[PDB]
Amino acid sequence: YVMAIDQGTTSSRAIIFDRNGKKIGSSQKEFPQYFPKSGWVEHNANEIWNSVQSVIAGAFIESGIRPEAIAGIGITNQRETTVVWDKTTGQPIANAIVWQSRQSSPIADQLKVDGHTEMIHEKTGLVIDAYFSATKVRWLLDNIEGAQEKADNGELLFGTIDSWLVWKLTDGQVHVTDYSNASRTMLYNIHKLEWDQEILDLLNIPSSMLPEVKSNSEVYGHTRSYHFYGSEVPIAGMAGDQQAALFGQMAFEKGMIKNTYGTGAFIVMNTGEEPQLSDNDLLTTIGYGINGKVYYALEGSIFVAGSAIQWLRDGLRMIETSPQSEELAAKAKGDNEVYVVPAFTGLGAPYWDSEARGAVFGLTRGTTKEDFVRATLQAVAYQSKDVIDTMKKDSGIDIPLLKVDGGAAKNDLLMQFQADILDIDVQRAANLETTALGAAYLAGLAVGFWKDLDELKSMAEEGQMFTPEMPAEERDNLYEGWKQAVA
């Protein structure tokens, strides 16, 4: 079978996808997110492992076949979260920073300033955007537990979620990572995919606790046991949610583009083997195509998206449930200038805002009780529009009927109020969570389970496009709001 497991940020979803693109489980658990002072959000490794176990072994709902035929494992874990654990005492005495809280601003700003600030960006593409894993580490391993000297002798070996789940999965393993997530961690690099020492040696310790990385289909078993081969069933995938979605959605050819609006609005393309970067405030990333090999591509720079939606329900309830967007909200015309950019800690986009926390905007009396709700629906799609519109202006590659998916993306209406200004169609792949399948496939590419990428092509469904509407000759009229009331 295929154990297409997902993780989002904590939202443990996905199950044992029964080979032929089918389902047999209802794994959906969103653990209680915490919001400390200001925006110092960070869920302890405890919450990570406790939830992961529920999906891993828990995925056995209907198709509970023993290790004798499961396989096809492809962990679609989260990404950028740098967790730690104490090897000597054997018990983790700390928390885990999250990729959605710019709690790094306190310190990172005093070190950049001079030339080296742009140094990384003007050449690579990425930029030290505070919450970028490595940068966050410069604070973590200091205030929490006084033992600087101990940090020299390993002590609390650091590593991303990948290096975490694997390490303490069953017990015994090596600090592994993967290319896809690697670049994001900033310790590695897109134009390197290897362990860049030199600069990194500035994180209090000279790269002492260096995580390992994996290249292609890391189809591998474990170190659990106790003199017996147990909880040592095969595996792969081991990649970030958004990264798995990238190649998973049949993206194995030129010009293949997608979209996945959920906790984050990440769009990735397929530029063959060209590590390029869009000088217009855009980042860099990797991709896949043709045969089982790593390609290169660009992405969209977003901090968060579906956070605004998860926010009100756990505060300004009102409507109780978030899916209301599909129901009592449709005939409500549209947002109407209230562009509430999901700014919990910083904004994101080409503008970043390393100090701006919170962004109400849309100062209009319309903001009554049930008003705030639809604001996010509109905003998220438009947030995608921000990078989309600017992208064509440089690359020149026009975007066709792109593929879209995601838990939050389930709102049919979201597709309509998005493609509008772009004047084109979109097609949602016949699969609510196609993301899980991507990383999952990377297990069969070893034991001769899967021949090669060229096979799935014959089975697809693209008859899910929305009919273009006549009313639109003005579109950018709203667009102007992006160039107003925000700075």
Q: Which residues bind a second copy (CB under 8 A)?
A: 27, 29, 45-46, 49-54, 56-69, 88-93, 168, 170-173, 221, 224-234
Torsion of CA 331, 337, 338, 340, to 10 degrees: 110
Annotated binding site for glycerol: 79-80, 131, 241-242
Report, in Å, the least distance between residue 104 CB and a second copy: 26
Per-position DSSP letters for 391-431, written without gaps between them:
HHHHH-----SEEE--SGGG-HHHHHHHHHHHTS-EEE-S-
Annotated binding site for sn-glycerol 3-phosphate: 9, 79-80, 131, 241
Question: Closest CB to a second copy among 166 and 347?
Answer: 166
The token pair at 55 is 């999906």
Strand order in the sheet with 74-77: 16-17, 2-6, 74-77, 236-240
Annotated binding site for ADP: 9, 13, 263, 306, 407, 411
Report, in Å, the least distance between residue 70 CB and a second copy: 10
DSSP-derived pairing of the beta strands 2-6 and 16-17: antiparallel
Question: Closest CB to a second copy among 5 and 375?
Answer: 5
Report, in Å, the least distance between residue 294 CB and a second copy: 31
Question: Closest CB to a second copy among 57 and 113?
Answer: 57
264: enclosing H helix or E strand: none
- Residue at 36: amino acid letter: P
DSSP-derived pairing of the beta strands 156-160 and 82-86: antiparallel
User: Residue 132 in 3-state DSSP?
Assistant: coil
Question: Closest CB to a second copy among 69 and 487?
Answer: 69
The token pair at 419 is 């493609």
Question: Closest CB to a second copy among 225 and 280?
Answer: 225
DSSP-derived pairing of the beta strands 74-77 and 236-240: parallel
Report, in Å, the least distance between residue 223 CB and a second copy: 9
Torsion of CA 370, 373, 378, 382, to 10 degrees: 140
**Are 135 and 101 in contact, with CB atoms under 8 Å apart?**
no
Question: Closest CB to a second copy among 81 and 243?
Answer: 81
Report, in Å, the least distance between residue 233 CB and a second copy: 5
**478 CB contacts (<8 Å, ≥6 apart)?**
335, 337, 421
**Are 439 and 3 in contact, with CB atoms under 8 Å apart?**
no
Question: Closest CB to a second copy among 88 and 477?
Answer: 88
159: enclosing H helix or E strand: strand 156-160
Question: Closest CB to a second copy among 42 and 405?
Answer: 42
Give burial (CB, 10 Å; 0-12/13-18/19+) of 458: exposed
**Are 156 and 86 in contact, with CB atoms under 8 Å apart?**
yes
Report, in Å, the least distance between residue 138 CB and a second copy: 25
- CA-to-CA distance for 320 and 8, rounded, in angstroms? 22
**Are 297 and 270 in contact, with CB atoms under 8 Å apart?**
yes
Report, in Å, the least distance between residue 209 CB and a second copy: 17
Report, in Å, the least distance between residue 416 CB and a second copy: 32
- CA-to-CA distance for 6 and 27, rounded, in angstroms? 10
Question: Closest CB to a second copy among 24 and 290?
Answer: 24
Question: Closest CB to a second copy among 62 and 476?
Answer: 62
Annotated binding site: 9-11, 13, 79-80, 131, 241-242, 263, 306, 310, 407, 411
Report, in Å, the least distance between residue 449 CB and a second copy: 18
Give burial (CB, 10 Å; 0-12/13-18/19+) of 474: exposed
Neighbours of 423 (CB within 10 A): 10
Report, in Å, the least distance between residue 122 CB and a second copy: 41
- CA-to-CA distance for 228 and 59, rounded, in angstroms? 24
Neighbours of 193 (CB within 10 A): 18
